[PDB]
Amino acid sequence: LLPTLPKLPSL
Amino acid sequence: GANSLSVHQLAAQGEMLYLATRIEQENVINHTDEEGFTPLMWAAAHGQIAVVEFLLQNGADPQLLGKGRESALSLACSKGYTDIVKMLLDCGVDVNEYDWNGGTPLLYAVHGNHVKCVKMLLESGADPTIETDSGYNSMDLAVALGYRSVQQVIESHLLKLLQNIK
Numbered sequence: 652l653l654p655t656l657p658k659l660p661s662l
Numbered sequence: 663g664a665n666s667l668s669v670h671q672l673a674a675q676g677e678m679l680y681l682a683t684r685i686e687q688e689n690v691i692n693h694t695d696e697e698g699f700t701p702l703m704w705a706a707a708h709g710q711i712a713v714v715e716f717l718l719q720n721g722a723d724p725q726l727l728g729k730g731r732e733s734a735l736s737l738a739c740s741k742g743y744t745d746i747v748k749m750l751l752d753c754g755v756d757v758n759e760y761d762w763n764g765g766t767p768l769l770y771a772v773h774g775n776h777v778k779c780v781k782m783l784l785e786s787g788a789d790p791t792i793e794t795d796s797g798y799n800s801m802d803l804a805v806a807l808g809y810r811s812v813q814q815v816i817e818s819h820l821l822k823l824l825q826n827i828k
Contacts, residue, residue: 654674657699657707657737659730662765662773662794662803 669693673701673717676710681717691722698729706734706750709743714750724753731761739767739783742776747783757788764795772800772816775809784819 664672664680669690672681681701685691694700702722705713714734718724727733735755738746747767751757757767768788771779780800784790790800798806801820804813 654671654704654708656697657703657728657732659732659736659761659763659765659770660740660773662763662769662796662798 668695669701670695670699670704673710673713674704674708676705676708676713678712678716681713685720691717691720692726694726694728698727699732700726700728700734702726702734703728703732703737706743706746707737707741709738709741709746711743711745711749714746718749718753724750724755727759727761730763731759733759733761733767735759735767736761736765736770739776739779740770740774742771742774742779744776744778744782747771747779751782751786757783757786758792760792764793766792768792768800769794769803772803772809772812773807775807775812777811777815780812780815784815790816790819 669684702717735750768783793799801816
């Protein structure tokens with residue numbers, strides 16, 4: 652429930 | 663507790679006061695973590711509008727790129743955080759940075775069907791012709807994914823670009 656690592660999605 | 667949290671986690675949780683203390687007790691406002699993410703990037707990626715504003719006002723570098731060439735902009739565009747996107751654009755950030763994921767802020771906004779983000783990026787000169795690894799530009803993505811409202815906005819912009827070329 653802690654914020655997850657920022658991640659850009661695949662395109 | 664908060665003392666065991668990174669400045670990045672504090673930003674992402676929207677803990678304004680705790681963050682404000684940590685960046686005054688030291689110069690960590692632009693401190694990059696193991697992935698090269700700054701607190702601003704964590705706040706952007708988690709939609710923490712008030713934290714983003716605080717960080718920007720206090721000197722957080724909005725243009726810094728992560729180890730994958732991520733920006734706070736591309737993170738906020740992928741999630742459709744329109745207010746955060748606008749704030750970053752008002753800083754004069756580059757909109758056409760191509761990252762190691764084969765993306766740009768516009769490609770992320772289109773992929774997420776975030777029409778207001780798309781409009782803003784286009785007005786700031788985002789290039790709808792830049793392609794993904796697989797050869798899809800912003801128009802190609804909109805058509806394939808069936809995001810007809812995004813497609814419509816890109817089309818109106820393409821007409822303008824075409825008018826300028828003639």
